[PDB]
Each structure stands twice: as structure tokens, then as C-alpha cells.
Write a protein that binds this ligand. Sequence first.
Ligand SMILES: O=C(O)Cc1cc(I)c(Oc2ccc(O)c(I)c2)c(I)c1
Length: 248
Amino acid sequence: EELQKSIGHKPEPTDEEWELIKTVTEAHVATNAQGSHWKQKRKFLPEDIGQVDLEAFSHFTKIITPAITRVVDFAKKLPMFCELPCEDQIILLKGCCMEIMSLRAAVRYDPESETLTLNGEMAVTRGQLKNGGLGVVSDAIFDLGMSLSSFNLDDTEVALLQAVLLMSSDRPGLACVERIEKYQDSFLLAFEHYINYRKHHVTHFWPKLLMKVTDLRMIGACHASRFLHMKVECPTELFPPLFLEVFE
Ligand SMILES: O=C(O)Cc1cc(I)c(Oc2ccc(O)c(I)c2)c(I)c1
């Protein structure tokens, strides 16, 4: 593998890697709430709502349960994820949930209206998402989305990104650190090959793309912190049970 790099050939996916790519892709596609048809489908959250504004908060938490479960359904469709013990599966899910959800919203960013679209249906602006409880985390996700425009990602690259986030062998508490590292590596390798095959005409695409992983981990972490700030303001009543399970 390093030899071909040396000779300057950019390896495309092996047949086994194509199988894994099809699986992850299909997993994302089956749980990503598009469309190909999001955006003739989105209703714009009224300009006055979210002008912590609890009214805005209520709209987000109304659809958050489905958004979260869609992330769990994704992981469920990856066999490697199934080989892991219940404790790990849960620790992995709680670790990547917001990284994956914020990626999913970021890739639905629209320059025209300057809106992200949540859960495939609700288009919000930067201010509305900030004020509905995300604060600077909203800025982070909008800046990310603006930035991902020119990466021209496809369903496959978004799915691989998700699986790479999911298989983070460094979440606290994990039993199978080694096995989870191996899965991720296998995802990163398929991913990179897939990118060589895709021949994006951006220089240093792969490293640039990996920096996005780091940003999403930051978004996750900063969200954990926003979550505390919310528990103190908004009344625990307003938080859906699954929302609480995942982040507390
Ligand atoms: O679009 C999807 O499937 C995923 C998705 C769903 C939602 I609701 C969302 O907004 C959030 C997220 C966390 C949070 O604490 C609050 I308040 C609002 C984002 I960003 C992404």
C-alpha cells in the first residue's frame, strides 16, 4: 500500500472495500431523512421564532428524538458495530451522536437562504439555532456547512465520515479499544480509496477532509457544555427522555 503511494499511484477501493462502502452507504441512505428531495420539502421556521428562547428550543426538541434515533438506526446497520458489546455500543453512540447529527445538518446547508435543514424538514437560520439553545455551537455548525459546500460530498463520503466518527476508540469507558481502532482504520482506508476513485479537483482533499473530523469532535464537546448550560435554564420537563439519555 505504501509502495503505490511511493510510486505516486492513488489506490481505489478493493472489492472487499467496495462491499463495505456499499454497506455503510446504504446504512446512511436508509436513515438520512432526505430526499434526494430535501429542499422542495423543507418548511422555513418563521422569522419571529428564536428572534435561551424557549419557543425555538421547543421546536428543536420536538424533532430531536427522531434525529437521534436515526443515528442509532445507522449504527445498527453496520455489522462491525454489532460485533461490539452493549456497553461499548452505548458508549460509542453517546460519543458520536452530536458529531453525526451536526454533520447531517451541515451537509444540508443552503447558501441561498443561509439555512441548515434539520431532520430533513425544518430550515433554520444561524440566529434561530443559536438562540434555541446552541449558542456558539450554532456558529460552528454553520461555518462547517459553508465550508463543506466546496467539498461536494456524496452520500458515500458522508456515510464513511459518520462511520469514522462512530468508531472512535478513545471514548472513555470502552472495553474493545483495539477492535474499535481496527474497524475505524478499515473505514478510513476504504474512505481514502473511495476519495482517490472520486477524483475531486481540490488539492489535499483527504487531509482537508480529516480536519473536518476534528471540527466535528469539537462541536460534539462544545455541545456537551451547551447541554449543561441548558439544564440550568430550560426546565428538565422540556427535554425529551431520549435527549436526556444520550447527553446526561
Ligand atoms: O438533522 C438531523 O437529522 C440531526 C439534527 C437534529 C437537530 I433537532 C439539530 O439541532 C439541535 C441539535 C442538538 C441540540 O441540543 C439542539 I437545542 C438542536 C441538529 I444541529 C442536527
